[PDB]
């Protein structure tokens, strides 16, 4: 998850691309 569960000032190795 992008900006919800794994913080808004961090996106994970899972969201982007």
UniProtKB/Swiss-Prot annotation:
Disulfide bonds: 2-15
Subcellular location: Fimbrium; Membrane
Family assignment from sequence similarity: Belongs to the N-Me-Phe pilin family.
Subunit details: The pili are polar flexible filaments of about 5.4 nanometers diameter and 2.5 micrometers average length; they consist of only a single polypeptide chain arranged in a helical configuration of five subunits per turn in the assembled pilus.
Protein name: Fimbrial protein
